[PDB]
């Protein structure tokens, strides 16, 4: 049994699609992980490569190399799952309950051996994925942590944003590791973060009002802004192109594809519910797969 609310979708190096779903209504509020080596067969359960039911619903996931799956659970747990040698089963490597509320976001650092997790318990934790222990726990925010994003190439640097209207840049090599960025005045609450793949000092963030903004960590100034969506921006995904595109997702049930100037180039209203996750295909850099709470897996082609 697969649940209706598709939560996350990630491609693998060989073109396989990892899906994470939850049941946010009905008798059971659980979740499930799935792996489709035929991406066009998703989300049909009978034509999947692997699949497992988990304890509670998943709120965010991410790959750990080519075999690991890191899951943020509603139970307050961080779970590492591993694939079978023949990649037919999804077995649990560890499941640690260190957060006191729903773990809402998780991100693997650049080395691949450590990760960072954020939860509604306002805390942000650093995990050693090999020792299955928490290296450090920080209580820097004053409200629910909305998103955390590891830097692409620095193992000690990562962004975080919470409902306390703070956007914190983190360098764990400092005695005070967090530093506040944010736009000039108290803007609308930050809801989505994404580092730039080519520029290690530049990122983008989307707020609750539908605005996507391009910021540089050095000059800490809103370099650009665009009212892209009519509702909260829940996700921001860059493309693997040399000059990358920006995929913006919102609760207005629409996907937008913008350029380096945050100008709208493509738009899809195929989903009839919230758009949760989007991923670009490594084999075909022009193919973008989106998932949503309408149990739809859409494959767009983008010029």
């Amino acid at each position: 049994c697969m649940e209706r609310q598709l939560e996350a979708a990630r491609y693998r190096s060989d073109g396989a699609l990892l899906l994470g779903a939850s049941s946010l209504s009905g008798r059971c509020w659980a979740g499930s992980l799935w792996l489709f080596k035929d991406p066009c067969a998703a989300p049909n359960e009978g034509f999947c490569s692997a699949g497992v039911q988990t304890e509670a619903g998943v709120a965010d996931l991410t790959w750990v190399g080519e075999r690991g799956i890191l899951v943020a659970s509603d139970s307050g747990a961080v779970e590492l799952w591993e694939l079978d040698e023949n990649e037919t089963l999804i077995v649990s490597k560890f499941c640690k309950y260190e957060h006191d509320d729903i773990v809402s976001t998780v991100s693997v650092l650049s080395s691949g051996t450590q990760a960072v997790s954020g939860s509604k318990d306002i805390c942000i934790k650093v995990w050693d994925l090999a020792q299955q222990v928490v290296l450090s726990s920080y209580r820097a925010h004053a409200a629910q942590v909305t998103c955390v994003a590891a830097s692409p190439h620095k193992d000690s640097v990562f962004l975080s944003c919470s409902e306390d209207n703070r956007i914190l840049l983190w360098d764990t090599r400092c005695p005070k590791p967090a530093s506040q960025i944010g736009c000039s005045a108290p803007g609308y609450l930050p809801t989505s973060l994404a580092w730039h793949p080519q520029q290690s000092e530049v990122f983008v963030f989307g707020d609750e009002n539908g605005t996507v903004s391009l910021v540089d960590t050095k000059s800490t100034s809103c370099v650009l802004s665009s009212a892209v969506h009519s509702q909260c921006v829940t996700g921001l995904v860059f493309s693997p192109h040399s000059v990358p595109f920006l995929a913006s997702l919102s609760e207005d049930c629409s996907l937008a594809v913008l350029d380096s100037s945050l100008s709208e180039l493509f738009r899809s209203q195929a989903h009839r519910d919230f758009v949760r996750d989007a991923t670009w295909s490594p084999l075909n850099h022009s193919l973008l797969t989106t998932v949503g709470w309408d149990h739809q897996v859409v494959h767009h082609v983008v010029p």
Binding site: R27, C28, Y97, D100, I122, A142, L168, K176, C253, R272
Partner: protein, 625 residues
Amino acid sequence: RVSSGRDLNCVPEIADTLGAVAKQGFDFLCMPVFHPRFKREFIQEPAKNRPGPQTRSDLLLSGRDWNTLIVGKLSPWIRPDSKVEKIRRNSEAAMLQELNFGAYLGLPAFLLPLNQEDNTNLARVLTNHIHTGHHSSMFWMRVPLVAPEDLRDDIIENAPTTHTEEYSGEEKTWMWWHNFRTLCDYSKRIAVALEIGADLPSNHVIDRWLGEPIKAAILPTSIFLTNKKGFPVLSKMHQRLIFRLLKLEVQFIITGTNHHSEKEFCSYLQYLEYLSQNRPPPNAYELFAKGYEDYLQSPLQPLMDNLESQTYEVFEKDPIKYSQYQQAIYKCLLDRVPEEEKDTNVQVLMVLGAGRGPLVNASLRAAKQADRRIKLYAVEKNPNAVVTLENWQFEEWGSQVTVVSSDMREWVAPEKADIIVSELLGSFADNELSPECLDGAQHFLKDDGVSIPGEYTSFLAPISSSKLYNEVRACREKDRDPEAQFEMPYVVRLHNFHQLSAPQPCFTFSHPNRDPMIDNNRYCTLEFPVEVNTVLHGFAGYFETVLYQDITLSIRPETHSPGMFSWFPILFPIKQPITVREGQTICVRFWRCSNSKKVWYEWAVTAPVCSAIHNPTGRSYTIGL
């Protein structure tokens, strides 16, 4: 035993989760009625037309289980006071939906958080929901003792945490409640679920919650330390706070995951039970007045009304008071009769207001103890108690006790008394008209006669208690002034309140009153220094009395007689609560007025702000002469 509940934000199956939390030993479960991450759209298509079902079915639990074991929780994404208009309206709709589903399930309580200063639209929606269908359901406002902004780690390099003392700032969360509670017009269905952090604030921040309607105390598992054997424990300050909360008889709510994973999760709860089963055992007074904590009662008027048999029974089962009376009579008998006159001198002793005759037996025991001869008159105007007095006299006392069924102010005594002994004191000393009664009886006292009690003095102290204020406000009756309940005193075992200043003497009376121009009217002005930020709601009243020399009785807290049961304190309310800042002085005025038919009190606060004069002309409360 403690009443405890388990807080969870993740419930896969409701039945298995409820069974697990019941096996762990919890009495109820705080859980979301909708999935916390299941954000719903009410205005904009196409997410507005999301296919159902929207949450779990109500058939998954029995109606009894919904009524007794489930506490609802508001979804964390509902922000009725968001700066965004879309989110504002959508959260209004979602909050109404969740509250209506909670009322549809018949839940006994529903949790709503207070995370910021501005909760005005939240208060508007909740007040609209309250005034929609008569219900008994409660709304617990989850309020942190310390705001998370004042609790975060000092790890933000360019935003350091303030190290400067901010006396009023550290109390900000109380304001969060006080404003909200004020916006909802002091609804009795709205209470506090106080959440406690790992680091406790100053003592004044904690004391700001004295007198507040605290129904629940929330303990996260993270605040628990660990001992040598690995069991979760608490620091001594947290133990003090737990004891203070146990005295208020609140429900404790364990939240968070099991961090002491080697031990079972019930360990946490067990610790509380431990802390409860080793709490300081209450004295005889606290056991006697357990069920009457903060229970408002009208003051007795034994002069105008005839007391019932069980009221006299309550008065009699008070051995400390009658031991003191007997000791006073013993000392007075030894003072008035020398040793060489013990056979020739027979003292005339008159019990004025004998009731069923405990003072008569006390006088007899004092005469036997002092080896002195006495002649007893037992005066009582209540004929129902005169029945008991005369049965006593025929069966035991004999001719030594002469029972007089009349008013002491009209009785024509056949002789004059060496000693008069009375018990006509109320919670506010003279509030039962002992001065007037002992004045009318003064003519048949000898020129050197003695009155026991010889003196009494009332005491007042400003208090803070939103709970008692709300109870008084609820005491509204038809066919009278809608605010008459605020202009009358109440006899009440004060429990959940905060004394704002040291008690000070109010009115003093002495007997016999040799003064030719006897005037029992009084006018007193009291200045109470207040060293905290608080809200004045009324004045507690106590009394002291000198029966004879160093033999005294007292319900004043500093000098209370240990183990005395006959008197609860009194409470004078005020119509409007008054904000009092740290360092300000509460100046209050009190009058004791009278005519030929009735006596009453009038009072008014004159500083830091003026109130209305309460009970003018005794319109709301009088004491019949």
